[PDB]
């Protein structure tokens, strides 16, 4: 007639990326980054086109896109109201991730090179942490973006004041305090493609403070690194087998050698040894056909193999490897594998961090340094 389940003795007490991001599609998640592409990591230069309308030299008209924005927003609202009116998932194609539609905000970073950084196509949430005032409080100061949550226990290193609302980017990679600023009155946003220039205005720009890392960047040739390297190659090989139209699913080796050119071919052959065999003569010659007993994994199994956040941690590791390599122990402490290990260990309560040090990304007294120091 009651509960009668002794639950207090048995049980004592989210981010959805785009379908191009969870499927690790090449443009957005690169297979190989060279040295000049690792120096320009997250700072991609303005490339000159060889073919297209902008490849011909001369003046080029920019095109306003406000009929396009409101047409796409009205179309997405029709899709949402036709599907029952709830919240929907829209980012299903690469053409959904254009800047030509939707409400864009900008997000500036305080640090030069953060320990973790999102790739194109990945999602993040805005959480407004609001500590109530002692006793009576009016309610969270309302904010245009994000959802509000009442935080008794401060997520960040410091603690919130009573009656202080702090917005923050929250995802699987990090959690970082953001601060809404209005845009300058002179700056517009030009989206250039091969066909032409397009212009939006911006009105909202956030400044992102020092990140609190939630994912540990691996070290060079570590356990996570070892796994990710061969897992990423295996996922790429499976997706090339899925893309093959020939009934005996067959791929070519120099497609994989074009994608991963730093790999020795012994490793690529090791990945192809199980699940494929080389045909030298007859039909399918110089192809790696799929074995007939091998069941090619489904889409959800391939998604469960490698996560996009592991790819971001690997990209952070190899970019920091390049920067350290170019600059000939203080710098090694500022490497993201050390700082991410230090911060995550401090969050479990293993150890403490010297908050003033050399891992400080500001170079002055502002900002923290995530390097391990004793509890006692």
């Amino acid at each position: 007639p009651w509960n009668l389940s002794n639950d207090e003795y048995y049980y004592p007490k989210i981010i959805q990326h785009s379908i191009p991001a969870v499927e690790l599609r090449q443009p957005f998640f690169p297979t190989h980054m060279g040295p000049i592409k690792l120096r320009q990591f997250h700072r991609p230069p303005l490339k000159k086109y060889s073919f297209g309308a902008l490849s011909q030299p001369g003046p080029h008209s920019v095109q306003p896109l406000l009929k396009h924005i409101k047409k796409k927003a009205k179309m997405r609202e029709q899709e949402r109201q036709a599907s029952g009116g709830g919240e929907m998932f829209f980012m299903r194609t690469p053409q959904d991730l254009t800047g030509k539609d939707g409400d864009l905000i900008l997000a500036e970073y305080s640090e030069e090179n953060g320990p973790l950084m999102m790739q194109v196509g990945m999602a993040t949430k805005i959480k407004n942490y609001y500590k109530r005032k002692p006793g009576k409080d009016p309610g969270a100061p309302d904010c245009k973006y994000g959802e509000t949550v009442y935080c008794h226990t401060s997520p960040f290193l410091g603690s919130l004041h009573p009656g202080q609302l702090l917005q923050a980017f929250e995802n699987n990679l990090f959690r970082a305090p953001i601060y809404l600023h209005k845009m300058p009155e002179t700056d517009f946003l030009i989206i250039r493609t091969r066909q032409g220039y397009y212009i939006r205005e911006l009105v909202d720009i956030f400044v992102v403070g020092q990140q609190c890392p939630l994912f540990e960047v691996p070290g060079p040739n570590s356990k996570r690194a070892n796994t990710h390297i061969r897992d990423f190659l295996q996922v790429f090989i499976y997706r090339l087998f899925w893309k093959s139209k020939d009934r005996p699913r067959r791929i070519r080796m120099e497609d994989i050698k074009k994608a991963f050119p730093s790999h020795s071919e012994s490793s690529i052959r090791k990945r192809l040894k199980l699940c494929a065999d080389f045909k030298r003569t007859g039909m399918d010659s110089n192809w790696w056909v799929l074995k007939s007993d091998f069941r090619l994994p489904t889409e959800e199994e391939i998604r469960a193999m490698v996560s996009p956040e592991q790819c971001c941690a690997y990209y952070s590791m190899i970019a920091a490897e390049q920067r350290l390599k170019d600059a000939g122990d203080d710098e090694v402490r500022t490497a993201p594998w050390n700082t991410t290990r230090a911060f995550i260990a401090a969050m479990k309560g293993k150890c403490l961090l010297e908050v003033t040090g050399v891992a400080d990304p500001t170079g002055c007294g502002e900002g923290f340094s995530y390097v391990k120091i004793p509890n006692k």
Binding site: L66, S110, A123, R194, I205
Partner: protein, 145 residues
């Protein structure tokens, strides 16, 4: 294949910025004829032509890194591109010291730790290339002379 889109910021003089803003928020293709952008083969020089009036432009490097973040519900935000360049209209000259927001000004001089930026290694490559034009080299740790 897919090529990552390349977004940059365009800064205009304030009267020309007001005319461009009014024409953008209007939304007609009349703006397309009015606003053009010609980038010179220097790579760091241009003309922006507002209403067929030429303005001189420089593509500069920004000290911080910005990221465009799109949303559909204003609760989850997806990163679309990285912005690091600005075509201000009116080398060391092509580096901007200030940031776009008001709190970030002279960021490069004051709020940036001076570990280093970059140049020295391209010169090293050139030096190694010249070195291979040698059979005998003479080098001496030197003093004031």
């Amino acid at each position: 294949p897919h090529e990552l889109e390349s977004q940059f910021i365009l800064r205009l003089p304030p009267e020309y910025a007001s005319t461009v803003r009014r024409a953008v928020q209007s939304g007609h293709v009349n703006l397309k004829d009015r606003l053009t952008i010609e980038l010179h083969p220097d790579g760091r020089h241009g003309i922006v032509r507002v209403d067929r009036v030429p303005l001189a432009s420089k593509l500069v490097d920004l000290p911080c890194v910005m990221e465009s973040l799109k949303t559909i519900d204003k609760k989850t935000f997806y990163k679309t591109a990285d912005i690091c360049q600005m075509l201000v209209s009116t080398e060391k000259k092509f580096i901007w010291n200030h940031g776009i927001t008001l709190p970030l000004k002279n960021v490069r001089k004051r709020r940036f730790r001076k570990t280093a930026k970059k140049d020295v290694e391209k010169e090293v490559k050139r030096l190694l290339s010249t070195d291979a034009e040698a059979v005998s080299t003479r080098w001496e740790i030197i003093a004031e002379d």
